[PDB]
């Protein structure tokens, strides 16, 4: 009741949240044929994402469809390397090593080790992302991070805090974030509840700026902001 794993003809993304929303049936369970209206309704219904932010994200998503000027995308279109998908993901390996769409325990064990308390704050989120960037640069001879990929990286850490947790305190319970990643299911039973206030483009930008301000390199090595 309310959740089904994907089956052999379903497609999934490198996005733990869209995967979770397909598993629940907010998005089509097969991951296919997602339009702007399905995106607005799904992200609104499940998470209280506002329409303008949903439309922005949809605009990016549609660029991954191999069909030009497409009005839909499928979740596996999002896995195409270096369109939106990028190196130094928190829970996916880099494309160079292996498929960059599915959960990777080794990678997620690294991320988790930088979430040092029961409550994730901006500092811990920023620190986990940093070590992923540096690790990929020092281990992946094809490491790359485009301007768009860097903006995505920073906004994905902002998103788990502000969409799953409390955008005002900029904190989220660690257990909730680990449950989302490890299960691709919303952690309702751990306490998650859809927020009453919409999550906006400005909310995402505000948390993204917080993430960057929590970075304290003596000297920045490559693309970090
Ligand atoms: C239409 C909406 C969305 C699109 C098009 C989208 C797209 C993507 C893509 C392409 C990635 C992979 C980037 C990479 O290589 O790591 C990703 C990662 C991610 N997304 Fe989404 N996303 C959407 C909505 C959301 C929402 C609503 C959340 C809320 C929590 C979210 C949280 C994340 C997180 C946390 C990651 C990072 C995964 C990792 O680093 O392992 N996304 N998303
Ligand atoms: C991830 O950590 C778990 C928990 O300590 C461990 O059992 C597992 O072997 C680790 N996986 C990798 C590939 O490091
Ligand atoms: C990887 O590290 C090098 C050496 O600091 C840096 O010049 C480069 O910009 C980094 N690559 C990315 C994509 O950040
Ligand atoms: C710009 C910045 C971040 C994102 N994003 C957030 C979570 N998944 C994708 C999408 C566009
Ligand atoms: Mg990636």
Q: Is 85 annotated as a binding residue?
A: yes
Beta bridge partners of 199: 49
Resolution (A): 1.6
CA distances from 42 to 37, 133, 144, 220 (A): 8, 31, 32, 38
Domain ranges for the chain, please list them. 16-210
Residue corresponding to tokens 């080790």: 113
Q: Indicate if the alpha-carbon torsion angle 45, 86, 139, 12 is positive or negative.
A: positive
> Radius of gyration of the chain from Cα atoms?
16
Six-digit token string for 80:
């195409």
Tell me which ligand sits closest to the C-alpha of residue 95.
Answer: 5
Listed residues: CB within 5 A of ion ligand 5: 85-86, 89, 92, 100
Which residues, in sequence order, are CB contacts of 100 under 8 Å at separation 6+? 14, 79, 81, 85, 89, 92, 93, 94
Q: Ligand 4 within 6 A of 156 CB?
A: yes
Element (H, E) at 119: strand 119-121
Do the beta carbons of residue 75 and residue 19 sit within 8 Å? yes
Q: Of the CATH numbers 1.10.489.10, 1.10.10.10, 3.30.465.10, 3.40.50.970, which one belongs to the domain with range 16-210?
A: 1.10.489.10
Q: Ligand 2 within 6 A of 189 CB?
A: no
Six-digit token string for 206:
């505000």
**What residue owns the CA closest to ligand 3's atom 6?**
222
DSSP state of 85: B
Pairing of strands 171-173, 119-121: antiparallel
CA distances from 183 to 3, 46, 96, 188 (A): 11, 16, 25, 12
Burial classification of residue 168, based on how many CB atoms lie within 10 Å of its CB (0-12 exposed, 13-18 middle, 19 or more buried): exposed
**What residue owns the CA closest to ligand 3's atom 11?**
222
Six-digit token string for 17:
């949240």
Element (H, E) at 213: helix 201-213
> Taking the CB of residue 175, how many other CB atoms lie within 10 A of it?
15
Give me ligand 5 centre to Cα 196, in Å.
Answer: 31
Residues with CB under 6 A from ligand 1: 14-18, 39, 43, 47, 49, 57-58, 60-61, 78, 84-86, 89-92, 152, 156, 159-160, 163-164
Q: Ligand 2 within 6 A of 109 CB?
A: yes
Give me ligand 1 centre to Cα 16, in Å.
Answer: 6
Q: Which atom of ligand 2 is found nearest the CA of 109?
A: 1
Nearest to 139 by CA among 93, 101, 85: 93
CA distances from 63 to 41, 57, 147 (A): 20, 10, 16
C-alpha span between 80 and 43 (Å, rounded):
22
DSSP state of 102: S
């Amino acid at each position: 009741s309310g959740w089904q794993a994907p089956g052999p003809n379903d497609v999934r993304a490198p996005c733990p949240m869209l995967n979770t929303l397909a598993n629940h049936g907010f998005l089509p369970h097969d991951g296919k044929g997602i339009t702007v209206n399905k995106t607005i309704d799904a992200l609104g219904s499940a998470l209280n994402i506002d329409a303008n932010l949903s439309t922005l994200l949809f605009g990016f998503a549609a660029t991954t469809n191999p069909q030009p000027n497409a009005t839909f995308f499928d979740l596996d279109h999002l896995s195409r390397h270096n369109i939106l998908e990028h190196d130094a993901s928190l829970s996916r390996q880099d494309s160079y090593f292996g498929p960059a769409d599915v959960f990777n325990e080794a990678v997620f064990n690294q991320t988790k080790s930088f979430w040092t308390g029961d409550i994730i704050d901006v500092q811990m989120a920023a620190n986990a992302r940093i070590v992923r960037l540096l690790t990929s640069n020092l281990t992946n001879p094809e490491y790359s991070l485009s301007d768009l990929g860097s903006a995505f990286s920073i906004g994905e850490s902002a998103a788990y805090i502000g969409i799953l947790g409390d955008k005002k305190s900029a904190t989220v319970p660690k257990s909730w974030v680990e449950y989302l990643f490890e299960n691709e299911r919303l952690p309702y039973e751990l306490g998650f509840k859809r927020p009453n206030d919409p999550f906006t483009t400005d909310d995402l930008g505000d948390l993204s700026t917080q993430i960057i301000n929590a970075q304290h390199f003596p000297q920045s090595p490559g693309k970090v902001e």
